[PDB]
With several copies, the nearest count.
Chain A
């Protein structure tokens, strides 16, 4: 009906943390990962206090363990007042601007400048980010280049004239700086030059807090041939705080299936929950997530209400997973190109 629908992270209302940042076993759409959600909440109090510039935290761990789910939990826990720029790591490879300029625009999008104006007397509020100020003052009719995105490289001299004016306003009280977050997911997709730009961009006084997520192991960096942990050089890994994410147990995988069967609005039998937890422990968590909705449609075509174990076994025979898919490809490897 609306533009929004049931996505992969639509069940997560936030990190289920109490007053003492201690994580609850199942709260606000999140379950498991107790040291990772507690470290995410300490980073959440660091973002809400706004005092320290340029802090950086890597969320590392295995695929399917919820690195991105912790990041959209902290994204809904901030609210719309604090900016949260969420980019992919492949988005910096632009044809109209350099990777340094694309990372500088992603850095300056996350620093909100709340300007008030008293204008018989009404205080209009124009919250705006530092990137919009640099695009408006970059040229005449530059305010449509936020919209169409056809800004080139903004000059560095222009950015020092905006940073100085904003410092002046802030000391005169006309503006309030609300520093924010920059989530670079799949950061492993950045090259050595962009990682070395991150080595000096995080030392700036106006840098946002930089969260990053990587499922990669001790691999090669994209611009070079050396092997380093997480695909990230040790020169940048000196500047971060790693948050590991543990693989799930049986009861945690089963409780991810009950919070998801609710978001997709499907009523499942308890025997089908045990068989789907056994499927989700044998192969993958995300394969058992996508079996829930297609099992609900097999239950709708038989005109039942409760999803049985036979709907799970029929949809398990209908759609394969990499493991079984790769096996079948072994035979037609001379048929496959």
Chain B
């Protein structure tokens, strides 16, 4: 059997024919303004007409930012390329950080050469360019690869499938990476990029204490469209606990569902969805097939949330190391 991870229940955005968001469809619950805005972005990626448009998902942690972009990746399918990328991946020891951004920008534009094969522009970049080493590939190579792909389209052997680059954790880029992203988003070959951050009003890395919203400078925030993600209500937290219980195969009683909903509004959404599998293992240790309230109450005494652990750190700060 396949392993069940986080966002394994996400099977696309829950929209109808009219493009409005359903309250509960395809594993997505709530957040209807962000889901209609992400459905308008999905239509852009499919129109294959625009290039270099940039989307920022913004909000508190635990509010569906990585889940909304993986719902975009499920709504596009495996035909459209998708290139997830953490923003801390640019600090390679082998190549410069703008080359890691440019290699990810070329990895997200696809070409289907026909007998059918799937290739990216970066695959043609490393094919036309001892211990192997990453190399800072010049724009001299990239322009004639763009002419070769243009001749491959004009004889009909190839078909281009522009895709999407997800730069999750965009606040971990430094100021040189944002300033190269100005020139990268201004090109007519760039992929549609979806950025994500949860680090509002923090300093840019690589600068000595200048402050901008989301960790992103105002000259890059001019070029993106913002999608905010408003926090969840108690009722929608319980629906996320219900969907994660059906995804992990866990039966649950309604009183334990009300207790895990009170736990998830007490601490956070993510602590209550990782209380499911330890309470299920405690239920199979006791031999009962479903979780009751005593299993959630005992497992919640065994594991702590970050706020209760911070209260333990504040009460006993002379004992811990600094």
Residues of B within 8 A of A93 (CB): 96-98, 176
Given that A53-B3, A322-B213, A325-B58 are contacting pairs, would A153 and B93 also be in contact in the complex, using a CB cutoff of 8 Å?
Answer: yes
Q: B50 touching A20 by the CB < 8 A rule?
A: no
The smallest beta-carbon distance between A170 and chain B, in angstroms, is 8
Q: A321 touching B226 by the CB < 8 A rule?
A: yes
Q: B1-31: contact bitstring with A at CB < 8 Å (1 yes, 0 no)?
A: 1111111100000000011000000000000
Question: When A and B form their complex, which 10 residue pairs have the shortest distance between CB atoms, in order from nearest?
Answer: A336-B200, A217-B320, A7-B188, A193-B88, A5-B51, A90-B176, A320-B226, A237-B306, A53-B5, A148-B129
Query: Does B40 interact with chain A (Cβ within 8 Å)?
Result: yes
Q: Which of A114-122, A239-247, A251-259, A268-276 contacts B (4 or more CB under 8 A)?
A: A239-247
Q: Name which residue of chain A comes closest to B94, CB basis.
A: A153
Q: B182 touching A202 by the CB < 8 A rule?
A: no
Interface residues of B in 290-322 (CB under 8 A from A): 299, 301-306, 308-310, 312-314, 316-317, 319-322
Given that A1-B160, A218-B317 are contacting pairs, would A315 and B40 also be in contact in the complex, using a CB cutoff of 8 Å?
Answer: yes
A286 to B224, CA, bound (A): 9
Q: A207 touching B5 by the CB < 8 A rule?
A: yes
Q: B221 touching A325 by the CB < 8 A rule?
A: yes
Which of B87, B134, B186, B313 is within 8 Å of A9, CB to CB? B186
Given that A5-B49, A63-B321 are contacting pairs, would A297 and B40 also be in contact in the complex, using a CB cutoff of 8 Å?
Answer: yes
Q: B314 touching A7 by the CB < 8 A rule?
A: no
Interface residues of A in 189-215 (CB under 8 A from B): 189, 192-194, 196-197, 199-207, 215
Q: A5 touching B189 by the CB < 8 A rule?
A: yes
Q: A21-56: contact bitstring with B at CB < 8 Å (1 yes, 0 no)?
A: 100000000000001001100110110011111110
Q: B21-50: contact bitstring with A at CB < 8 Å (1 yes, 0 no)?
A: 000000000000100110011011001111
Q: B44 touching A229 by the CB < 8 A rule?
A: no
Residues of A within 8 A of B160 (CB): 1-3
Q: A241 touching B317 by the CB < 8 A rule?
A: no
Query: Does A290 interact with chain B (Cβ within 8 Å)?
Result: yes
Q: B314 touching A244 by the CB < 8 A rule?
A: no
Residues of A within 8 A of B75 (CB): none
Residues of A within 8 A of B76 (CB): none
Q: A99 touching B91 by the CB < 8 A rule?
A: yes
A103 to B312, CA, bound (A): 30
Chain B at the A interface: mostly helix, strand, loop or mixed?
A: mixed
Query: Does B177 interact with chain A (Cβ within 8 Å)?
Result: yes
Q: Which B residues are within 8 Å of any A CB, using their own CB? A: 1-8, 18-19, 33, 36-37, 40-41, 43-44, 47-53, 58-62, 66, 84, 86-89, 91-98, 107, 109, 122-123, 128-129, 131-138, 140-141, 146, 149-150, 153, 160, 162, 168-169, 171-172, 175-177, 179-180, 182-183, 185-190, 198-202, 213-214, 218-219, 221-223, 225-228, 231, 248, 268, 270-271, 274, 277-278, 281-282, 285-286, 299, 301-306, 308-310, 312-314, 316-317, 319-322
Which of B1, B131, B169, B188 is within 8 Å of A150, CB to CB? B131
Residues of B within 8 A of A89 (CB): 179
Query: Does A127 interact with chain B (Cβ within 8 Å)?
Result: no
Inter-chain pairs besides A4-B51, A229-B309, A318-B40, 14 sampled, C-beta below 8 Å: A9-B188, A35-B301, A42-B299, A53-B6, A63-B222, A88-B180, A94-B136, A95-B94, A200-B66, A219-B322, A229-B306, A319-B40, A329-B201, A333-B201
Q: A62 touching B319 by the CB < 8 A rule?
A: yes
21 contacts between A and B (CB under 8 A): A3-B146, A8-B185, A52-B3, A52-B5, A91-B180, A95-B95, A96-B93, A97-B93, A148-B138, A148-B141, A196-B169, A215-B321, A237-B309, A244-B312, A265-B49, A297-B40, A329-B214, A332-B231, A335-B60, A336-B59, A337-B61
Q: Which A residues are within 8 Å of any B CB, using their own CB? A: 1-10, 20-21, 35, 38-39, 42-43, 45-46, 49-55, 57, 60, 62-64, 68, 86, 88-91, 93-101, 132, 138-139, 144, 146-150, 152-153, 155, 157, 177, 179, 185-186, 189, 192-194, 196-197, 199-207, 215-219, 229-230, 234-235, 237-244, 247, 264-265, 284, 286-287, 290, 293-294, 297-298, 300-301, 315, 317-322, 324-326, 328-329, 332-333, 335-337
Given that A100-B88, A204-B5, A294-B225 are contacting pairs, would A242 and B305 also be in contact in the complex, using a CB cutoff of 8 Å?
Answer: yes
Which of A3, A207, A229, A320 is within 8 Å of B313, CB to CB? A229
Total CB contacts across the A-B interface at under 8 A: 359
Q: B176 touching A189 by the CB < 8 A rule?
A: yes
